[PDB]
């Protein structure tokens, strides 16, 4: 009795959609000047969003549509059009998918493999949908996004115990832009998430320096810390030191040095013979890259420093 078109709509969050309807009753076609729209038979759509395209065809539009929460076995919203009070039982279903997904990729210190992970906790809106990665390789590094690149090829990822889909890139190019995105892909079509470009050099995780050793200077009263610069990366970068009096729980206090070529620093401590735990992190100055893990704990020795003034 009533006809809707299009019957199936699949759109992302934030877009705009339109619907059309023709109603007939009592062997007569009702004029389009008395058609009102209902959403899920609960809220009444304001008249300001209505439109007339023909003598007996109505039109409605949706602005800043919202995420469709699933309720029971049904996972879609129904839109009705009808005259005055009597309304037909036929409905048009509307599907809304949140397409935005955060994908995190990290470059290992060896500059050989990329560890890429992402979560699927936002998929609860609609289940039984195919999620597939798609990354585009460019000889030149990524830049301002002109548009969606037609050339694409796929790559699979597996599922670990944490519930986050993970896959590893190998081998990798140091100065190649990997413009990657995720795609939801359903029996009704497909939707593509916004792309993201990652520079391989930008997200490098430096290897943690090792072989740290702290000592109390003799007849100087300062703390001497010795180690070696990590092999990767070979660029300039700053160092962070965190030390305390070793125990079950330790009250750390930070220190930073911004000179890459610097090897050791000196700093006095009020205490004279105290076992100390000293740790160092390594990070590039400008902010690019990720913080490295803490190194092995370095301990000191208890032994007399200078001649007592009061015996």
């Amino acid at each position: 009795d009533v006809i809707y078109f299009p019957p199936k709509i699949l759109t992302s969050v934030g877009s705009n959609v339109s619907f059309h309807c023709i109603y007939k009753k009592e062997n007569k076609i009702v004029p389009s000047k008395e058609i009102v729209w209902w959403m899920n038979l609960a809220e009444k759509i304001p008249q300001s969003q209505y439109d007339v395209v023909s003598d007996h065809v109505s039109k409605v539009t949706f602005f800043n549509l919202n995420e469709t929460k699933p309720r029971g076995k049904f996972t879609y919203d129904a839109v009705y059009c009808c005259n005055e009070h009597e309304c037909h039982h036929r409905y048009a279903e509307l599907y809304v998918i949140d397409v935005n997904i955060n994908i995190s990729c990290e470059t290992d210190g060896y500059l050989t493999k990329m560890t890429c992970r992402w979560s699927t906790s936002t998929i609860q809106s609609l289940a039984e949908s195919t999620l597939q990665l798609r990354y585009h390789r460019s000889s030149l590094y990524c830049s301002d996004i002109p548009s969606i690149h037609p050339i694409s090829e796929p790559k699979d990822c597996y599922l670990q115990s944490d519930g986050f889909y993970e896959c590893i890139f190998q081998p990798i190019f140091l100065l190649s832009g990997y413009t990657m995105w995720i795609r939801i892909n359903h029996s009704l079509g497909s939707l593509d998430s916004p792309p993201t470009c990652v520079l391989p050099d930008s997200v490098v995780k430096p290897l943690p320096p090792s072989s740290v050793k702290a000592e109390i200077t003799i007849n100087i009263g300062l703390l001497k810390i010795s180690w070696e610069k990590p092999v990767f990366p070979e660029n300039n970068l700053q160092f962070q030191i965190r030390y305390g009096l070793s125990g079950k729980e330790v009250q750390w206090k930070m220190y930073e040095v911004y000179d890459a070529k610097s090897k050791s620093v000196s700093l006095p401590v009020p205490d004279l013979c105290a076992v100390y735990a000293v740790q160092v992190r390594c990070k590039r100055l400008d902010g690019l890259g990720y913080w490295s893990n803490w190194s092995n704990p370095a301990y000191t020795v208890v032994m007399d420093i200078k001649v007592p003034m009061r015996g």
Binding site: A42, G72, F74, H88, H89
Partner: protein, 146 residues
Amino acid sequence: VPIQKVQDDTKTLIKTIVTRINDISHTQSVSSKQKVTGLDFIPGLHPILTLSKMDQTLAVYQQILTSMPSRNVIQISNDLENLRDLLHVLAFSKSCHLPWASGLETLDSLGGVLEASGYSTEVVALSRLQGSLQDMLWQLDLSPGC
């Protein structure tokens, strides 16, 4: 058992069914009358004044809910069966015999209605049930006749 205890248990079951219906996420703001042209076999609209028509409405609602596999629907159907038994006992207590009458025999198109408007075939129906349930309580606050 005293008649007052039976009436109190009936009212408690009525309120429990109303609360259970209100907990469904589908029925948040649906009203209770509607004018769905394609759904006319569902009881409602016109009021009920006799026990025979009331049992007929209960049986039709039970048959409507039988076509749904949800656990909440099954629980509501069991509560409706208990309410029907209580109503039969109450009717017998007033020396007015009420024969057991089944539902409508020509409900076959109902199935077709489902494959057209399953969602709707649930939602409004549930709302209508709740509406009847409200009148249910009111119909027992005026001492109805046989």
